[PDB]
């Protein structure tokens, strides 16, 4: 999910790139600007939205102590889908 | 019962408290505000002019054989007009007790040396001067011990910036190590961590 700017430079997942006229591009001459190609916006969206039975569902990373602090989501909204604040997972009911 | 709270051996509080008074009325000309802390350690505050008589007494006296000078520190407190509060930690090896002796000073109020009494002071005695600018009388050598040969400063004073005023680098124009004013690449990040709540009500200061 990496897109190249018009100057040929690679845009990172934070949206940064150096303009064609910026002198700081010199550091990449004869070298490369490493960018991580596994974006976070795209990968989290490709997950399926889980469906649960209760109106309040817990979320942790999955392993318990290896995850993130125990949080509780409210799933009364129907127009939107409740999102865990730490990990970007989503939950619905029905 | 209470595995967290430290055991309190109150016996050694009485012994120290008795000795502090004994020193108080056997050397009244200088002794000020003797005190004993929770942690059972005695603390005697001495007028600066009485450093030699108090330190000489506490070493030679039969009932107070404080022959080992543990260290000679200095606390900078800009709040009080007499900033530098010189501290002497002493040890006995006979009565197995530690006693602290404190005096005050100032950047224009030197203090009499102690190398005559405790030779251990000699190097500690310069360390204070090199770090705090507290001149000491009657010292033999008295030169900087820690800082570079060209610091026009006194690093441990609270008015001295942590990064200092000068940095060293190598220059080819002059082919020697040169000194230039400090320009940090990433400024030291002062974290305002103080909480706004009374952690300890036992130390409240009314207005």
């Amino acid at each position: 999910g990496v897109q190249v700017s018009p100057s040929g430079e690679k845009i990172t997942h934070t949206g940064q790139v150096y303009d064609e006229k910026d002198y700081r591009r010199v550091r990449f001459v004869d070298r490369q600007k490493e960018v991580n190609e596994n974006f976070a916006i795209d990968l989290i969206a490709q997950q399926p939205v889980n469906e649960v039975e209760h109106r309040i569902i817990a979320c942790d990373g999955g392993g318990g102590a290896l995850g993130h602090p125990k949080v509780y989501i409210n799933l009364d909204k129907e127009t939107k889908t409740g999102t865990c604040g730490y990990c970007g997972l989503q939950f619905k009911q029905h | 019962k209470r595995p967290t709270v430290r055991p309190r051996s109150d016996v050694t509080h009485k012994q120290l408290s008795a000795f502090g008074e004994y020193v108080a009325e056997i050397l009244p000309k200088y002794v000020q505000q003797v005190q004993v802390s929770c942690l059972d350690e005695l603390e005697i505050c001495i007028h600066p002019d009485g450093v030699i008589p108090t330190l000489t007494f506490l070493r030679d006296h039969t009932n107070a054989q404080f022959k080992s000078l543990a260290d000679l520190t200095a606390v900078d407190v800009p709040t009080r007009q007499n900033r530098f509060e010189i501290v002497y930690n002493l040890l006995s090896l006979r009565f197995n007790s530690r006693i602290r002796v404190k005096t005050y000073a100032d950047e224009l109020t030197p203090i009499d040396s102690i190398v005559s009494v405790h030779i251990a002071a000699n190097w500690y005695e310069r360390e204070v001067w090199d770090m705090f600018g507290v001149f000491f009388f009657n010292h033999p050598d008295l030169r900087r011990i820690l800082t570079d040969y060209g610091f026009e400063g006194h690093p441990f004073r609270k008015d001295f910036p942590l990064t200092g005023y000068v940095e060293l680098r190598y220059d080819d124009e002059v082919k020697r190590v040169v000194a230039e004013p400090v320009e940090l690449a990433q400024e030291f990040r002062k974290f305002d961590l103080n909480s706004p709540w009374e952690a300890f009500p036992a130390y409240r200061q009314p207005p």
């Binding site: - | 950047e107 224009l108 109020t109 030197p110 600018g133 001149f135 008295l142 030169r143 900087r144 570079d148 040969y149 060209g150 220059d171 124009e173 002059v174 020697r176 190590v177 040169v178 000194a179 230039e180 004013p181």
Partner: protein
């Protein structure tokens, strides 16, 4: 008012010490330049000694002057012996730092300094 003295009854007495310390430096510049191979000549070395004194010629507290003299003697002891090398002695001459300007317009052009 009512401040204890330190090696000085009055300013005039402490001025003698400063004049004693100056005679110790003026007699010493020609020995450091040779003992440690400095690139300066003795004539301009003595100028810097004098300059470092006029930097502190506006002081009038007897106690301060004595401390200045005490530090100067320590500065002299580290130079009488070669404890401080060519790197330290040539640090006073400031042969690398750009001469900071004084004109307000020059300051206005470069930097936000007052």
């Amino acid at each position: 008012t009512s401040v204890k003295p330190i090696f000085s009854r009055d300013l005039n007495e402490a001025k003698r010490r400063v004049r004693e310390l100056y005679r110790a430096w003026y007699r010493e510049v020609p020995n450091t330049v040779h003992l440690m191979q400095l690139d300066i000549t003795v004539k301009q070395g003595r100028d810097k000694v004098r300059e470092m004194f006029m930097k502190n010629a506006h002081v009038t507290d007897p106690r301060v002057v004595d401390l200045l003299v005490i530090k100067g003697k320590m500065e002299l002891q580290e130079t009488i012996k070669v404890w401080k090398q060519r790197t330290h002695v040539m640090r006073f001459f400031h042969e690398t730092e750009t001469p900071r300007p004084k004109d307000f317009l020059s300051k206005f052009y470069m930097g936000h300094d007052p």
